[PDB]
């Protein structure tokens, strides 16, 4: 939420996008289309798998410990054994609760970030040939058929080819 | 004459709620569970060496209660004590039972080496109908009930040096007769004394004559004690009556062995983490099954669920 | 501070804004004005109240424990009782110190974020009719009376109505 | 022909400094205090049941020191011990005083049920001028000082089965006379013995004759001991002298009761969290009032202030 | 990584920049040059030194404690002494591991942020006289000699002086 | 007709790998080490007062073993016990050795004040060839071995009030003879008794006759005990034989003193943090040298390295 893309200027997600986390929808002279962006998708997945691998990193191995259940009342020493264990459990429970809260806050922000990064990358490709409509969409001011849209999706769009046509349409 | 290009992200129809720093409940596309909350109910017999105590507590197998004879010289990573266990020999108590149970459990072995103590002047291998072994009156297999020979009980003064290179655990005891006639009949003298010493430590126990509640046929008791002897040190046993002598020593080891109270059955499977409820997987970092555990285990926490987000915020239309 | 709006390209705060956390100041043909933006204000407040509710979530309830003050010297067992409590207090003190540091760092960044989001939302509304002056202000290149400014504040500004007038002023 | 539209944020003239990951002191518009550092100084009498011990420690109310007679059969969630408390009966000691105080405190009741022990052959209800009850020499109300009858003291051997379904706490004792004349005058024999046993446990205490420092009129002492008896188990008391017998048992409960040392007065208010300084609010997550607490309390920390930011960075002009 | 500047739209770092963390490279009519930006450099250093000072803030001082090594087997009380210490060490080890992970994640993001802030500050200075080429570089559409480049680096660039020349070159 | 202006950041040819929330290993331009993992191997003699025990344990310096005479009335912040230490006086044991060692170590002083106990009727300053001081048979310097005078040993009953304003630590003992002839020769009576009491506490120890393993010439032993007496309280020592009497008291203090087992040599340097491996710097927050520490120390952790990034991601070309 901290970049304002997901659940922000992008109104909602696409349930019909099943082959990626992020991607492109277009409308042009030949129709409409949808395509997943694999690099941004993979960047967010790699980060989430990294944090998952860290959280499950290593299992403490413990053997003989102290007793934790008691059938007889004893007083002082049993009070201390119980207090030590209860103290330990409360602190680990705190660590677990905080860990998940921090990680989940960070996961929501990093995935929002990757969405924003793809948007900013696309904006920069388009240079003076498109305008940001404010809802995650670019209005592209020149004829842009399927190969042209494809060139934008794979980072090879040449803005100079269309600049004259786009400037003419943009400025009356 | 133009086109529209929209950037966007996926969503799912079935999101899952997670907690964050700022939100008690926010929907993400997926999450994974971090708290292990279930068990199959079976203790896997691999990779740790499980010894099922069955009807025997560890202390009764140590002392040599007849129905525990099958545990002689046993080893374990985890000794499992069953709630149905019972004593069926001479009624006894262990001052600091918890500590002796612990140090034997942690040692992980009942390996016992007989030693030839010089009991000249007394009769050996006293028995009782409270502790039958087959057809005969008997006694704890690792203990030696000494009593008068030809109506005398001399001051016993015997020694056993530790000339090896490892520690020796000696289990010994004191007999508490229920009446003065028992005392004089067994030990001649009106009161006994047991002193077990090393170069650096000593224990003296004075028996106490009197009735205790009837248990397995008897109002008398025995009291169990223990002494560790390091290499180069010497055991010296000094008594003028009521001595329940050791027959030898237990080899003390260090390592990863322990003991667990559990009624869960043992199965053929492999699991690093054991709880009294049964073995549990250890792929999650936390668990809510039991604070009692053994092996490579998740950490016990009070929460029964903790969802780690593995996807973006879920924003459907 | 991480987005560079608050205490960054916005030079300072407005002590005279008393009815909101974020908002708009304008100068046009009819005078000057100030108005709070409630949605951004509320978004930051909701997040801060969420973190406050979590920090105060549940009070551990403890009953019989161990003793923690002693009138007699005793040695080993008292050493251990004291050490257990001192260990516990030091760890909870660490948790409290870290919690406040992390939360306060995050609160400063989220409020900076909400300021940036409102700025970016306004920029996107204005399309080709204004330019970013670099200090949080837009220079609007067309007559924009009080209703027009109001339309920007409530998200109904129609950039097409003014585009011709704005382009003419922008480009000589 | 145009307009200017400036985006911005508020500020306050009176900001507050907070700590962050990167800054020891940075000014935000507002903050809230997370460490509770004050107390009203009163222990609120709701919602927990407070029992003010006044002049009585818990152990003296347990044993039945005469000025503590008003505490017979009392209950509490929190027993408050005052620093002015004092003993005013027979001078005594409790081996493991701390443990008996703890287990009674945690039980939360002094509910006492008389039992008819068979003390045939001895005189009952010995008294002392060190323990006056009104005009008469007396003794601890829950204890029974036994001594010779017609110049004999037979071997006492009495039993009390637990045929109910709950645990019984027995408090008993041993008398240490200051001289041999006292010993023979009270118990005939030159030395006594007290053995209290169950099916599974036993305690033998041998009294010791000799002078102790004069306390409340006496150089002799009594020593206090305790024995818990579970359902189906049996108490057996065996003595040939110096026995300070129980008159019955205390009902043991489990639950949330405890005990606190405090001189704070008790007031009419409600508060979940109690410290020895008084009750404290529990709206904050941490507190610096006292590591000793009872109830639903903030966690004790060393810091006396921790400010949580509740607003943006404060950037005035 | 969360802003997408460092290790993102800026392809790589400059090993030859030895007098600052961030800065400017230019090409114009008089040649090429490199200059460090001290304010952004100092802002990131100040933050890192702040977090370093906090991590090393205060050393707990402990005196008489409990024993932690033992030459004799003893059972219950020694089990508890060992368990208390092992419990403490595991929790402090957890705190240390988490602290470094969180701090390092934050340090990478704050330094990325400072790079983005300098880029955004420069973009805003240039107004309509330059275009973002998508790789951290601005194409400046007017003659901009060494003093002019210097004016951009020290925040005194006057976009109005060059706007007419720049607009003419930008739009054919 | 234009220019290009590129924004960018530095890099280094030699980056360093760090851990993050999302990355086990990511390269940054620089990092700093947070775990102190080395020691010079020397205990710095400033700023804490180090007392090298050399051949003496703390308890042997307390009791006054002759080769420990140089430690009389010593003070310390940290008493360092060497593994080569040895006892060379009468063979002895201390029930709860660990606790007495701890309370003296924490007190930080062996300051001893002689008191004139009234030992009328007994001979004082018994000695033994196991405890030579120069040419003469001797004994622990702070203890007073009492025995018969003119073939009698009367019931000793002596008192020592604490009329000062500070606490007194008394060290005393009980002699265990190896044979009945020793017992009667030294104390006339066939068995002894030692009772040490205050207004509020009492200890009775009954000696035990019999052989222990030969140590430094002897099969007999002494057992060491201790009693603290608060202001306004009184020490009363009552014995009919086998008493090893105190010669006075040790002043008990509270403060920052402690004790450490270490063979590291002491050097001329200053260091706030001491480990048994030697002093360590305390500029880092954590350390992996030793869980045993004294002073202002980093916190012990299991990791031997933790790298804190002090620079941006390293992105070379
Ligand atoms: C101090 O005081 C105690 C308490 O009074 C005395 O202890 C009792 O001693 C007697 C022995 O004289 C014990 O009596 C024995 O009880 C056994 C337990 O029986 C239980 O189970 C049966 C059913 O199987 C029930 O009917 C019964 O009520 C009990 O619940 C019996 O097994 C024994 O009986 C066997 O031996 C006798 C011969 O004596 C035969 O008559 C029987 O048929 C059978 O073969 C026996 O009766 C009694 O249990 C003890 N009580 C306790 C609480 O320990 C001490 O003796 C006394 N000390 C002195 C010195 O006097
Ligand atoms: C072993 O050694 C100890 C120590 O010497 C002996 O213990 C002492 O025993 C005597 C009894 O003979 C005790 O004497 C009593 O002291 C009481 C305390 O008095 C204090 O308070 C008054 C003011 O009220 C002060 O003036 C006084 O100095 C004390 O500070 C008195 O209350 C007693 O007096 C009452 O009784 C006597 C009759 O004996 C009358 O004369 C008095 O007027 C009054 O009515 C009494 O004097 C003494 O306190 C004990 N000391 C300790 C330390 O315990 C043991 O007796 C000895 N053992 C053997 C076997 O000999
Ligand atoms: C209960 O049972 C125990 C065990 O049997 C008896 O304890 C033994 O008592 C005897 C005394 O009669 C002790 O004997 C002494 O041993 C000392 C240790 O010697 C060691 O070192 C030498 C080398 O220096 C070795 O050669 C030797 O083997 C030992 O390893 C000696 O120092 C003593 O010798 C000195 O005195 C004798 C005079 O008696 C001279 O002959 C010698 O030359 C020398 O001057 C002495 O021999 C023995 O050590 C005890 N053993 C233990 C384990 O304690 C108890 O006596 C017995 N109790 C009763 C009441 O009988
Ligand atoms: C020694 C003997 O045979 N005594 C006869 C007793 O049978 C009888 O008292 C009866 O004793 C019963 C228990 O007897 C044993 C036992 O515990 O089995 C018999 C054991 O052989 C004996 N062992 C030794 C080494 O002496 C053992 C021992 O004395 C005690 O366990 C010590 O506490 O006792 C049972 O208690 C009966 O209830 C009881 O009547 C006596 C008198 O009746 O006659 C003896 O001939
Ligand atoms: C039994 C009796 O009356 N003895 C006479 C004593 O008064 C006197 O010794 C005096 O004893 C005083 C304390 O006496 C009591 C007490 O503690 O109040 C009297 C109690 O009735 C008695 N109780 C029982 C059950 O015997 C109690 C008991 O013996 C002791 O507490 C046991 O330690 O003693 C006080 O100590 C006086 O200082 C002392 O002189 C003797 C000899 O003088 O005469 C007896 O007639
Ligand atoms: C008292 C005395 O001189 N006894 C003669 C003994 O020398 C001898 O028994 C021998 O005793 C040796 C140890 O003797 C001492 C000692 O420990 O040095 C002599 C001390 O003076 C004496 N101190 C006191 C206050 O009595 C001390 C004491 O009795 C014991 O330590 C108590 O346990 O004993 C050594 O053990 C020899 O091995 C032993 O033969 C006897 C009989 O031989 O003759 C006595 O004349
Ligand atoms: C694993 O085994 C442990 C230990 O047996 C289980 O914890 C135990 O759960 C029972 C639930 O039946 C608790 O007893 C019950 O408590 C309620 C009140 O909470 C009471 O109304 C019932 O009459 C009964 O006494 C018991 O306290 C609890 N024991 C401990 C030590 O916490 C646990 O449920 C098992 N977990 C799994 C996943 O199998
Ligand atoms: C709540 O009550 C606790 C316990 O009484 C208070 O803590 C105690 O505060 C006193 C302050 O008077 C400490 O005693 C003093 O220590 C200084 C040195 O620090 C010394 O110079 C004085 O002569 C005096 O001894 C005392 O150590 C401390 N006790 C504990 C266990 O920490 C606390 O202040 C009270 N808090 C509130 C909010 O009422
Ligand atoms: C500081 O001193 C401590 C304590 O002496 C050192 O820790 C000890 O390190 C030794 C390494 O020689 C450990 O003993 C060895 O263990 C291995 C198995 O791990 C075994 O194969 C060897 O035969 C030997 O027994 C010892 O367990 C360990 N002690 C403790 C309590 O952890 C530490 O290395 C020293 N650190 C520095 C920086 O000097
Ligand atoms: C979403 O999360 C669920 C549950 O955390 C994942 O389901 C697991 O999938 C793996 C791999 O197929 C299985 O081995 C597990 O048994 C599944 N667990 C459960 C509880 O069902 C799921 O794969 C995740 N990913 C997606 C895209 O749904
Ligand atoms: C990068 O980190 C290293 C090591 O953390 C720094 O080297 C330290 O520099 C200080 C100041 O000159 C010295 O006092 C230390 O002794 C050095 N430590 C080590 C381990 O070498 C270095 O200064 C940091 N900065 C740069 C720019 O490299
Ligand atoms: C990019 O897409 C264009 C148009 O579809 C295609 O011709 C070209 O081969 C693609 N290049 C790369 C590197 O993907
Ligand atoms: C055993 O003890 C007896 C009696 O003390 C003794 O005579 C004998 O020599 C000792 N040794 C052996 C091997 O019998
Ligand atoms: C927005 O503001 C305009 C101009 O003041 C007003 O006419 C219109 O009703 C407002 N609409 C909404 C949805 O707030
Ligand atoms: C009480 O004890 C006496 C003496 O042992 C005995 O005679 C009597 O039967 C017992 N029971 C009752 C109820 O008196
Ligand atoms: C900025 O740079 C210009 C051009 O080099 C120079 O003339 C001017 O003095 C500088 N001003 C400041 C404030 O640095
Ligand atoms: C010491 O004790 C003796 C014997 O009990 C006694 O006679 C004497 O008065 C006491 N006091 C002094 C100072 O000798």
Residue numbers in the entry:
A (entry chain B), C (entry chain B), E (entry chain B): 1 to 172
B (entry chain A), D (entry chain A), F (entry chain A): 9 to 325
Sentences from the study reporting this entry:
IAV strains are named according to the antigenic similarity or serotype of two major viral surface glycoproteins, hemagglutinin (HA or H) and neuraminidase (NA or N), which also play key roles in binding and release, respectively, from receptors on airway epithelial cells. Influenza HAs bind sialic acid (N-Acetylneuraminic acid, NeuAc) containing glycans (sialoglycans) on cell surface glycoproteins and glycolipids as their primary biological receptors. Previously, we and others have demonstrated that over time, IAV HAs within the human H3 subtype have evolved more complex receptor specificity, selecting for elongated α2–6 sialoglycans featuring at least three linear LacNAc (galactose linked β1–4 to N-acetylglucosamine, Galβ1–4GlcNAc) repeats beneath the terminal species-defining sialoside moiety. By utilizing a variety of structural techniques, we provide evidence that this enhanced mode of receptor-binding has evolved over many years to include mutations outside the traditionally defined sialic acid receptor-binding site (RBS).
However, pandemic and early seasonal H3N2 strains from 1968 to approximately the mid 1970s clearly show little length selectivity, with observable binding to most receptors within a given structural group regardless of length (see strains HK/68 to Vic/75). Interestingly, from the late 1970s through to the early 1990s (strains Bgk/79 to Shn/93), a marked decreased in binding to N-linked and biantennary O-glycans containing only one or two LacNAc repeats beneath the terminal sialoside is evident. Crystal structures of HK/68, Bgk/79 (A/Bangkok/1/1979), and Bei/89 (A/Beijing/353/1989) HAs reveal a generally conserved pattern of either 7 or 8 H-bonds connecting N5 of SIA to the backbone O of residue 135, O1A of SIA to the Oγ of Ser136, O1B of SIA to the backbone N of residue 137, the side-chain OH of Tyr98 to O8 and/or O9 of SIA, and a combination of the side-chains of His183, Glu190, and Ser228 to O9 of SIA. Thus, while binding interactions along the length of glycan receptors potentially favoring selection of extended glycans do appear to occur in early H3 HAs, such interactions appear transient and poorly conserved. Firstly, between 1968 and 2000, enhanced binding to longer receptors evolved by spreading binding interactions along the length of the receptor sugar chain, rather than concentrating mainly on the terminal sialic acid moiety or terminal sugar linkage.
